[PDB]
């Protein structure tokens, strides 16, 4: 997976390499005798020796082995250290490699300071061939040579073995590596400005497909317009394939994996927004009927991939509450959407349009302290296939759907959404319902780039270095709306797991009391958390995005998010 | 779900109950007002209060909550103790319930001495209804009443809600509970002496199906004869359903979940013994075509399940090797199966039949030390509905298939198996091959009262109490054949995970050296094991059956296996 590296010793500055199978120190120069790689099952692979670093406990011995050996061949980094079987640490005595317990040695990659496993092992999934898209198995034996990477022939292109034994089995696939150009594996489309990849004879789970497109630099297929929906349904392009539409990795509701706005829809009524089989949270496209069906996120299906062709407060009238360049007025006289829209046209305005989470925050906290009551929103659909559009023509940037939303019914021509709940999230409604409504009309600093993004009257920033707790700063999460913005931010940053972020919640002492560094009004613990006292609290993305998990204050490191002007 | 219980305090002997929402000690009068239950997400549910025990951390408070509350409602047992959020332990001050750190209190179920988490939470899967077999979600709200178990209406039978919210969602299912009689959910069949249950409107993963019927007291369907195949092929049941044929929970090779002999086969050549999609380790039956297809163990498919209608030392001639009432002779003159069978009929004997793993051990270690050579076995098939049978009429009790075996080809009339490998495991062969062969002919205390099972010349025993390491005895695993027998024993005992067993391998001190309690010649570590030094080594069943994992010597408990008379 990805670049080879050299293993520099911290205390000496020498690079380790095997001679006759035994580890020795050497001058750190980038010749082919010092390059190390990561191969599957957490194995360290010396490229030139074609052998893998391992221990023999059957006291013990540290040397190179044939990479398919039964010896202990796995290695994990523990805070610059590198331990193996029974946490024996890789160390260097008199310039000779030896593994011993409690060793206080330091190792780091050559040319940087990051640990050996700082870069995660990236799977390289295949297409075509006989392997049905199963990922590359590194390394694999071909008549004497251990291959850690794809092979060039002309086999149609770069190819790899997909099982731990190529002498038997004989299963292989064409390597899908990240590209800059949009050919070989991709197909250009000037009409949409995005390259598509139709993995048709493959069979991957939705998470596996999303990882396959992540590692290719692309994203899972999102369909934003009717022109795209009518497309693909022609052409083999697979009979049924995955699409980025998922409920798994969002905080409630459905979304596109690339966080494009979810406003063009085409639910199969048999497998709709509210899934028939409970807990099936990942949708697929049927290239025959054209419909999108909710489905079990673990089913093995073909998949499509796409990537782009990269080229102050105000004042209003009395009663109207202000927010940035706009002002909102809530109407308690419950009315249909047509009557509310017309009545707000009479107020020389229109039904509210929402584009940021700040808009939701103000239209939940500045207007109320109802909550249970649904409130009308300008967003509406009139066409089949579904296309939600704002009443005031503004572009659809935000779609803040609740769980199992948007639940657009079959063939019903008018579909009119509203907001409910503590978070003000949206759900589709029959347009004749009589609800309250909110209407918008016009009214009347952080440091420069880079990395700062302003939410409301607070400036947020992502510190991108996997650093221990309390370094840089301590973020305080005051409300669930702040939590939601943090969720959107983390989601927009990292893909998908692998990267945690730091809260400011910490238990000094061990009494079991978690507090910020100077009132714990808001709490967002994950499943079975805290689970232990005296910890430092972190959060991540993916499923349970933003949920608080406890971490070791000593060893665990994560990224930082921090705010000013608060 | 399972039985309600009372929570007796260790130091006093009193069992706790809520009054006005606050926990107090009381005289254990086994009345319905002190009965506690387990509900999902590790929640403790008081039956009469219909509320769940919980903590408030926003300083510290222990009381009852509505089970849908956002408060900390989960509880985990730590060696008779019971901790919650941040490991605050349930305790009793002056007979009043309070959660405090480092509390040295003890709790036990009422009427016994087992801990609160000694009994595992059993899912109750459903059939019919609109939920497609998804399990019961306990508890569920119906107009004021929180229901922790299935309820009787006329609903056709017992029914439950399958989501966390039944007033919304409106998803329900028919309770599939363990039965004594063979009606209501089942269908009798005198021809086979086994009741069948065809879950057709369901969609479950292989593991969820196996657990569903495990919880039902039955086992996944195994087809042992052509009559059963022809029966299932006819029958208005599911077109495709799961069957117990799996390669996941075995040490290697395919087997039946009920450990029935795998000798009747019907592989679909499209999805055969050697899976098309690598990693597909769970097979299914097509009741239309009647073929068995290897498939992804995570696919949601219907499933069928069946339960029964319950109604040492010899000597031979020179050269021949002795084993109980039988004797084996290996022939090095490579020959076809027919030529070897005829030649051994000329020696007034027959091609070897194998019935125990001890037979495999002697025919691997007593006759040879090589290994790479395949050796003929008496087992053979002649039918197109595949049925392997011994040449000497002996009953096929053992089927010791290698990985991706039995690889029965399509329409091929003669199928003749052989043994290969270090473990002497079997694989199917074209019958014309010229191999060595082994032939058998006749020849010339523990007690079984106490749970002991004789393997070779050694008696083994499974102690049924989840006890800490070394309490009973320290088991030494000498050879891979002993490990294999242990796999058979554990598999026949426990279903499926959840129950660990104790080895004798242990690291006293923390140098990282694991040894038995009185030579580490044989080692069977699991993936990324040993993960830490100074541990006590246990093993389990399921996937990675018998593989050694390191565990805490203080807190971890497991079962015992121990041997005598060797």
Numbering used by the authors:
A (entry chain B), B (entry chain A): 32 to 89, 92 to 187, 189 to 269, 271 to 346, 357 to 414, 416 to 490, 500 to 573, 580 to 627
The authors write:
DEC205 belongs to the mannose receptor family, which also includes mannose receptor (MR), PLA2R, Endo180 (8), and FcRY. MR family members are type I transmembrane proteins with a large extracellular portion, a transmembrane helix, and a short cytoplasmic region. Their ectodomains contain an N-terminal cysteine-rich domain (CysR), a fibronectin type II domain (FnII), and eight (ten for DEC205) C-type lectin-like domains (CTLDs). The functional studies of DEC205 show that it can act as a receptor for dead cells and may recognize dead cells through cellular keratins in a pH-dependent manner, as acidification usually occurs during the event of apoptosis, but the mechanism of the interaction between DEC205 and keratins remains unclear.
To investigate the structure of the CysR∼CTLD3 (residues M1- S627) fragment, we expressed the fragment in insect cells and the purified protein was applied for crystallization screening. X-ray diffraction data were collected and showed two crystal forms, one in space group C2 and the other in space group P1. In P1 crystals, a homodimer of the fragment forms in one asymmetric unit, where the dimeric interface is contributed by the interactions of CysR∼CTLD1 and CTLD3. The CysR∼CTLD2 region of DEC205 has an L-shaped conformation that is also found in the crystal structures of MR and Endo180 and the C-shaped conformation of the CysR∼CTLD3 fragment of DEC205 is similar to that of MR at acidic condition. Notably, the structure of the CLTD3 of DEC205 is different from the conventional CTLD fold with two unique loop regions (loop 1 and loop 2). Loop 1 (residue E521-C528) replaces a conserved α-helix in the conventional CTLDs, and loop 2 (residue T573-A592) becomes much longer and partially missing in the crystal structure. In addition, previous reports have shown that oligomerization could be a common feature for the MR family members which may correlate with ligand recognition. Recent cryoEM data also suggest that DEC205 may form dimers or tetramers, which might be relevant to CpG binding. Similarly, the dimerization or oligomerization of DEC205 may also promote the binding of keratins.
